[PDB]
């Protein structure tokens, strides 16, 4: 819906000041502290302050561990979602490791974890990376480390052949059944801001409700997970004895081998005796210190299930291109230059693909910077050359690197929108509600209602504006005319849309007779206007930008 | 030895310029681009350029891998020596691992390496650290990784009891002899700029002379070493047979157990036969598909030596506090501010303990900075806000953090010395040869000869100087008088010690009648003098420093 805005008057000039005590900036390169009239889409301006972000060359060494900032982990610095998961797949090989490990056959043995590839890619929002330097199972590198192996049920042991001297059946580890049934562990998902916990079996009424098993280390991007039910089968041998009996010559041995006992046939020439043929598989053990005291039986095989829960950790991170943000502004009658870096900045690769800044005009600024068109980005709170806070986000690929789209995303996820770029001139000056009011960064009902300023048709449509929402006004600079004999004017719009005013500054911009400086850089703060004017020579060479300060009567 | 220096004259002033277009600096905080007359010991000045180094807060995450810069590894960035070494100590435990590993009983088994603690401490010059995240042998973390296990001689195998069906003696791994002899590996020292190599057995005349075994990765601080002769003993069993013979009823078995053979006694009721008692230890194997075809013998134990060479890598680093260097200078009639960072600078902890800068007056500078009084330091080559090169050193503890001592050390190891601080006034102006000549940073013969300037007694002994060796002169600023009615003068000394000149600048420093500005900041470049004068109010409050430029007639 459209809303007419009447021109209520012309604010006169109360004073004009020069600014000849500042670093010289090339009219060809731009002002280091004053935003150009073409940069409204990069700001939520608050004064004569300018920012610029640069991206450092980077490699796989510049890592950002997954340290999620949550109610449970308020010290984390990652705002983007990430939910990796995987399983311990059961097969002869992995089962070997688990078996040798739980039975103490070798404490170095460990099964390799199988992460779900897609969960690591994380939809590229952002693309995550597994830190394979975190651990190694022998010659194999892996981003996962099994912390605890817990058999669901006590590990069984098989008996051995009775001891010659003791006549006692020993013990040994069951034997993995190669052609047995393998069950994969359940789904193991990593958590970073709390420990893995199992319901306290005694919960109602005794505390605590849950029992922590293992803990993650979010600062190092280490998550914690539980992979239940890893299963495989083993063969257990139980010694099942059969009676041993004696007979003596002349009695004869059975015509057929014995199957339910062993018979020992004694003679005169051999009072000790010799056993009658017995079914293969039967084991006879003659006690050495009393051969006439032997026992017999078989080591019968039994198939059994071995289930184990495995708790493990995983190390993750994403690439994070070091940044360098220049933050310069005017104050105390001089220019304050400030620089700050994030990460191990080395050499500049380029300027940041996207960057929007909300400033207070005094070195204060909260910004959103994405080195690329998608992926890792930083929501940064800063003051001068000091980084107060940093929270990372990720720009979805579905934005196709669209400034307009990104603007809305940043608006919706971070409450930031370039309020300084709404003014435009076609047949008349116009600006959507959102920017004019400059209070709600998000799109919404009435947010796109158009405020059209009556009596502004004389201005050129190619005029460019950068506005400053302060107090009752939205002050935007750069209403230019097709006729240079007509000096640029500053526009003062009421944020309630009641009406607007212009401020003719033809005098302040007057260099020669019938010749004025154009407004190319503009800012408004504390009721003071700051102007920057491009400059060149008769020949056409770039010169230092002209800086003035103009105070309007309000 | 002393050398008289006559006053040859007074250079007049050819021109005076003001500098009112620069950032305001507090007379209480200092000039951001002009070295104070009290900072000669911090520079080898070349113009109106000032540097300052800050140290960032740091923890164990700020690591500097041991990457030595050598003819073989010119891309390395470490100049300090480091020679870690250790051994693989032989004992039942480590031997177990080596045995199970070389015989393939388990490829995850590995012996832990024992580094020589003192070699890691490295005399604290600097203190090195082992990266235990590099590898793990099961639950144990270790900065070392065995790459190759190479038995000095083919691994022996012991025979087993002949197979029932096949009647063939098998094989199995020898048995480690617990109470055996253990030999430690030889001395294993890590190298970083080349691979470990063994003489090519065929060298004369066939190439290459040596054979690379394993390679280090200096960029990651990974060294490579060879630990020869790790030794332990094992018991090997060789199947030594004895003949098997038959006899038949009525013949009788020997009265005593057989010790050199086995006798099988057949009968009518048992055509197969029963063996006559035989010495314990003897093993009889009756072929199942022909019991009358059995063999006998013993599994005789033999002690043997097992030696193995182990090649391994180790990951090392030292703590490296991120740095931030401000580099500002005057040029093109304005002040050029530049900042640069090294490492992941976060928050400032303090100013660098020690720092000396050789400047060219145009943003160019090569410096030596040590965040602390001893330890890791950086030799840095820079231009404006760009780090050209960085080479790390370590300041020996034996310097006790002595500026004077450090100065000499830096002089001797890096060819850098604060040439700007030699001038001094007692009864007369005086300066050692080294600084006056400003060509050889190191101490040496004649380097401490004193040049005394005649006719300079009127100056105050509390005068402070910062000199600039350029072309034929050593221009130092700040010859002050006890009587303020007498303005400061700049001293121009000939580097060949032929004589000196003064430059009276009472006019340029004249603010009021019978009142002048004192020279508090000074620099000389391209025949132009740059002055900074402290300022205050009648009340005594700090004001902006006054800056002028004075050209002398030469
Ligand atoms: Ca337009
Ligand atoms: Ca003195």
Curated annotation (Swiss-Prot), chains A, B:
GO biological process: symbiont entry into host cell; virion attachment to host cell
Organism domain of life: Viruses
UniProt cross-references to InterPro entries, sorted A to Z: P2_sf, Phage_PRD1_P2, Phage_PRD1_P2_C, Phage_PRD1_P2_N
Alphabetic keyword roster: Disulfide bond, Host-virus interaction, Viral attachment to host cell, Virion, Virus entry into host cell
Coiled coil: none
Compartment(s) of residence: Virion
Disulfides per UniProt: 253-276
Predominant location: virion
One Gene Ontology term, aspect cellular component: virion component
Pfam families in alphabetical order: Prd1-P2 (PF09214)
Function field: Adsorption protein. In association with P31 and trimeric P5, forms the spike complexes located at the 5-fold vertices of the capsid. Involved in recognition and attachment to the receptor on the surface of the host. Likely triggers the processes of vertex disassembly, membrane tube formation, and subsequent DNA injection. Essential for viral infectivity.
Protein name stated in the entry: Adsorption protein P2
């Amino acid at each position: 819906a459209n809303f007419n805005v009447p021109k209520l008057g012309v604010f006169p000039v109360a004073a004009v000041f020069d600014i000849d005590n500042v670093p010289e900036d090339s009219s060809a390169t731009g002002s280091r502290w004053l935003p150009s009239i073409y940069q409204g889409g990069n700001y939520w301006g608050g004064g004569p302050q300018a920012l610029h972000a640069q991206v450092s060359n980077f490699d796989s060494s510049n890592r950002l561990p997954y340290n999620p900032r949550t109610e449970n982990n308020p010290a984390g610095n990652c705002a983007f979602a990430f939910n990796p998961f995987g399983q311990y797949i059961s097969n002869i090989s992995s089962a070997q490791s688990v078996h040798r490990r739980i039975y103490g056959i070798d404490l170095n043995d460990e099964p390799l974890f199988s992460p779900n590839a897609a969960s690591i890619t994380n939809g590229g929002n952002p693309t995550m990376s597994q830190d394979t330097g975190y651990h190694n199972i022998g010659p194999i590198n892996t981003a996962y480390k099994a912390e605890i192996f817990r058999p669901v049920n006590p590990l069984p042991m098989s008996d051995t052949a009775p001891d010659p001297e003791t006549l006692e059946p020993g013990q040994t580890e069951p034997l993995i059944k190669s052609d047995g049934v393998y069950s994969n562990s359940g789904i193991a998902s990593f958590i970073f801001d709390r420990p893995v916990t199992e319901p306290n079996p005694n919960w109602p009424p005794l505390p605590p409700p849950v029992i922590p098993i293992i803990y993650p280390t979010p600062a190092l991007g280490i998550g914690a997970a539980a992979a239940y039910g890893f299963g495989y089968q083993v063969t257990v041998y139980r010694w099942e004895e059969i009676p041993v009996e004696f007979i003596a010559d002349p009695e004869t041995c059975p015509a057929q081998p014995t199957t339910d006992k062993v018979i020992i046939r004694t003679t005169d020439l051999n009072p000790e005796g010799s056993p009658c043929a017995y079914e293969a598989g039967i084991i006879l053990v003659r006690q050495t210190s009393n051969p006439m005291n032997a026992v017999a039986g078989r080591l019968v095989p039994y198939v059994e299930d071995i289930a184990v829960d495995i708790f493990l950790t995983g190390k993750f991170f994403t690439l994070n291109p070091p940044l360098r943000i220049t933050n310069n502004y005017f104050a105390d009658d001089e220019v304050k230059e400030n620089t700050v870096t994030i990460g191990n900045y080395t050499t500049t690769l380029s300027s940041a693909y996207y960057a929007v800044y909300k400033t207070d005009g005094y070195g204060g600024a909260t910004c959103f910077i994405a080195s690329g068109g998608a992926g890792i980005s930083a929501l940064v709170q800063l003051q001068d050359n000091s980084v107060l806070d940093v929270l990372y986000y990720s720009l979805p690929l579905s934005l196709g690197g669209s400034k307009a789209a990104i603007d809305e995303w940043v608006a919706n996820n971070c409450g930031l929108f370039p309020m300084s770029g709404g003014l435009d001139k076609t047949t008349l000056l116009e600006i959507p509600r959102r920017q004019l009011e400059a209070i709600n960064p998000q799109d919404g009902p009435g947010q796109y209602d158009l405020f059209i300023l009556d009596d502004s048709g004389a201005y050129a449509s190619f005029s460019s504006f950068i506005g400053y929402p302060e107090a009752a006004y939205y002050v935007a600079g750069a209403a230019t005319f097709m006729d240079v004999e007509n000096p640029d004017e500053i526009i003062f719009i009421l944020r309630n849309g009641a009406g607007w005013y212009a401020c003719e500054i033809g005098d302040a911009l007057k260099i020669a007779d019938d010749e004025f400086d154009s407004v190319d850089y503009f800012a408004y703060r504390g009721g003071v206007m700051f102007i920057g004017s491009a400059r060149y020579t008769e020949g056409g060479d770039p010169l230092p930008i002209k800086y003035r300060a103009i105070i309007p009567g309000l």
